[PDB]
Design a binder for this molecule. Structure first.
Ligand SMILES: Cc1ncc(C[n+]2csc(CCO)c2C)c(N)n1
Length: 389
């Protein structure tokens, strides 16, 4: 099991970033001296902009380069990201840092499609699940390591960032010896039309994309919300346990999603709408309680419900589509998700735009998930009217 074990070791090491938990307290700390206005209005949105603009060329280069060099591109981008996060001041350098984080994250689809051209067709699902679990274990291990090192050990965030850079460098070293994958546009667009030219073919797609949008745009500013509620100047912040338990219970929910004896056509959209309304309630609670432990708990509830929703949505999408287009659909829906996220980010987040405060944009995010709650309910009620006949 050497080729799969090496790949899962690479996933474990690349995903083992103990500093994503403890990021905003470092960025706004004495190490870089960046004000919350500056960070949350110009630094962070560049990640979304870069991820959007680079998802398309990454997707093209992945198939153009036979899926191998994109993994090393991800490793090198992570290495330079974690070096510049050790040594960069000002604003432009950190903006390019988030650009490099974007080019790193845009290649996750490439990393997960690398498996399809090196393994057997029958075992592809099981090895993909194994690698996803490897990434989850890596992130949980990094999260608990950072929490243990910053809570009782009293280790500064600079050394923790050094650990993050060491782990991503080890990931690059592992990736360098990965076995090579030895194994129209109008028509593809016409086939893309056929990807939604049916009753269930269109379904779950835009809701997967829009829920992914909400998740992506709330996870990173949730760090800022925790910083605002509990400042890091003279208080100990327990992020690592929370980013550990969130991923752990998300994996648990992913496992439990397949054990529910429920058919899609019966109440799938109704259950998704209920889950989305619960997500909106959790976001509003996290924004408005003013207590830190309960807002971490509501964040964990968000994580669990989002993982359940994504698992059911991607199960339905995979049932709708063929195995040869898994990467294509998972790329197109992520592309439109980042497009809508960037649109809303220029509307409410970007300093050149309206630049609304972080405590205010979460009121939109709660209403934003309340907005998808209504349309999913309305589309769910649309099937109910058809179910009447
Ligand atoms: C270096 C770096 N780390 C994380 C993010 C954004 N981000 C992605 S996932 C997640 C949750 C983990 O706490 C966060 C904050 C970034 N833009 N740059």
């Amino acid at each position: 099991f050497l080729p799969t074990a090496l790949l899962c070791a690479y996933g474990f090491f690349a995903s083992l970033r103990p500093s994503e938990p403890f990021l905003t307290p470092y960025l706004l700390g004495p190490d870089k001296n960046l004000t919350e206005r500056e960070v949350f209005n110009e630094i962070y949105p560049v990640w979304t902009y870069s991820y959007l603009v680079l998802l398309f060329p990454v997707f093209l280069a992945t198939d153009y380069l036979r899926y191998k060099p994109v993994v090393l591109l991800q490793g090198l981008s992570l290495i330079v990201t974690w070096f510049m996060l050790l040594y960069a001041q000002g604003l432009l350098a950190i903006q390019f840092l988030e650009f490099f984080y974007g080019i790193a994250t845009a290649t996750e689809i490439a990393y997960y499609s690398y498996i399809y051209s090196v393994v057997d067709l029958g075992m592809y699902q099981k090895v993909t699940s194994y690698c996803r679990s490897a990434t989850l274990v890596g992130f949980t291990v990094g999260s608990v390591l950072g929490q243990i090192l910053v809570s009782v050990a009293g280790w500064s965030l600079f050394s923790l960032n050094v650990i993050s850079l060491t782990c991503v460098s080890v990931a690059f070293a592992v990736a360098w010896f990965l076995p090579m994958p030895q194994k129209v546009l109008k028509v593809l667009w016409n086939d893309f039309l056929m990807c939604y030219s049916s009753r269930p073919l269109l379904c779950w797609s835009v809701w997967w994309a829009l829920s992914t949008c909400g998740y992506f745009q709330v996870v990173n500013y949730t760090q800022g919300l925790w910083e605002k509620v509990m400042p890091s100047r003279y208080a100990a912040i327990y992020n690592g346990g929370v980013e550990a338990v969130s991923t752990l219970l998300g994996a648990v929910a992913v496992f439990a999603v397949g054990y529910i004896k429920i058919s899609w056509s019966t109440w799938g959209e109704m259950t998704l709408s209920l889950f989305s309304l619960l997500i909106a309630a959790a976001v509003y609670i996290m924004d408005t309680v003013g207590n830190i432990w309960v807002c971490y708990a509501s964040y964990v509830v968000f994580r669990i419900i989002y993982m359940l929703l994504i698992t059911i949505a991607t199960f339905q999408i995979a049932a709708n589509l063929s195995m040869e287009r898994y990467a294509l659909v998972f790329g197109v829906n992520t592309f439109i998700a980042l497009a809508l996220q960037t649109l809303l980010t220029l509307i409410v987040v970007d300093a050149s735009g309206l630049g609304l405060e972080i405590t205010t944009q979460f009121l939109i995010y709660a209403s934003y998930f309340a907005l998808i709650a209504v349309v999913f309910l309305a589309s769910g009620a649309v099937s109910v009217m058809k179910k009447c006949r």
